[PDB]
């Protein structure tokens, strides 16, 4: 639950040259992004998650 004291920064992307295509090709393209953790990664202090909830039993 990050606050201003433990902030980590930002990521940005820019055109270094631009996209060049020949005739007969679609002009627009798309990029996809994947995330994962490295081999020095770890966590601690177990807690309950805020993503699941119920209003009564039998759910």
């Amino acid at each position: 639950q990050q606050d201003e004291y433990t902030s980590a920064g930002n990521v940005t992307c820019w055109y270094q040259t631009g996209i060049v295509v020949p005739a007969g090709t679609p002009t627009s393209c798309s990029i996809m992004c994947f995330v994962s953790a490295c081999n020095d990664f770890s966590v601690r202090l177990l807690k309950d998650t805020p993503f699941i909830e119920q209003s009564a039993l039998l759910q």
Partner: protein
């Protein structure tokens, strides 16, 4: 054989369509040795805060584009801690790695020359006149070569065929250079050592080398291919040293 990776500081460049790497005269950058020094105070060497890739702003390669040039240093004087170390010292010294990127499709065509010219002294469009520094350089923005003879006062004579130096443009291959042929590769890489007649120098007063990008075969394409094709430059200093610490100068 076509894939390459370059790491400097906290920055990395990958490429999948490279030709090779040019090492200017077979000499890699290095620090100044003891039997070649003249300044006596201990120098500072930041070594990761200054020696990393900085990216300039891009230009648009159009169907009738004459070409572009930059001056080094003075194009990196507002870049992070390299610029700050430039402002507080009297003497500096560094080599460079230059990387130019431009990609396009297999239905495009065109050919660019990428060349580094040491001590590129330029002339004025008025022959009974002198140049000023605004006409020579705009920092991270590129100057533009022209299509015909230039006129008016205070501008540089910039018709591409003479390269603004009174030479033939087809002979610039005497300097360290590479080509970007759109059907072959999409990037050029040049490693430049420190080249001067003195071991250190002031970085605001003297332009050590000019970077020129000149298309020999214009950009062409057909019916519905992409029209926007940008070119991008990225430069990293190497073995950076400074001497003569005092208060910060002001331009």
């Amino acid at each position: 054989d076509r894939v390459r990776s370059i790491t400097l500081g906290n920055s990395t460049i990958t490429t999948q369509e490279s030709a090779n790497v040019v090492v200017a005269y077979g000499r890699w950058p290095e620090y100044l040795k003891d039997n070649e020094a003249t300044a006596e105070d201990q120098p500072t060497q930041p070594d990761v805060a200054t020696c990393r890739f900085y990216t300039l702003e891009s230009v648009t390669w159009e169907r009738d584009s004459p070409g572009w040039w930059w001056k080094f240093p003075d194009a990196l004087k507002d870049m992070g801690l390299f610029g700050q170390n430039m402002y507080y010292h009297y003497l500096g010294r560094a080599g460079y790695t230059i990387h130019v990127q431009c990609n396009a499709s297999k239905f495009h065509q065109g050919c660019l020359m990428v060349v580094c010219v040491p001590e590129a002294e330029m002339g004025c469009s008025q022959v009974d006149g002198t140049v000023n520094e605004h006409s020579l350089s705009e920092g991270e923005t590129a100057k533009k070569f022209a299509s015909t003879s230039t006129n008016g006062t205070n501008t540089v004579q910039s018709i591409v065929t003479n390269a603004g130096m009174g030479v033939g443009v087809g002979n610039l291959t005497i300097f360290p250079h590479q080509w970007i042929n759109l059907r072959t590769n999409n990037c050029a890489t040049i490693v430049m050592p420190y080249i001067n007649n003195v071991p250190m120098d002031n970085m605001f007063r003297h332009h050590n080398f000019t970077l020129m990008i000149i298309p020999f075969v214009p950009l062409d394409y057909s019916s519905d291919s992409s029209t926007y094709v940008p070119i991008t430059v990225t430069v990293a200093p190497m073995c950076a040293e400074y001497n003569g610490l005092r208060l910060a100068t002001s331009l």
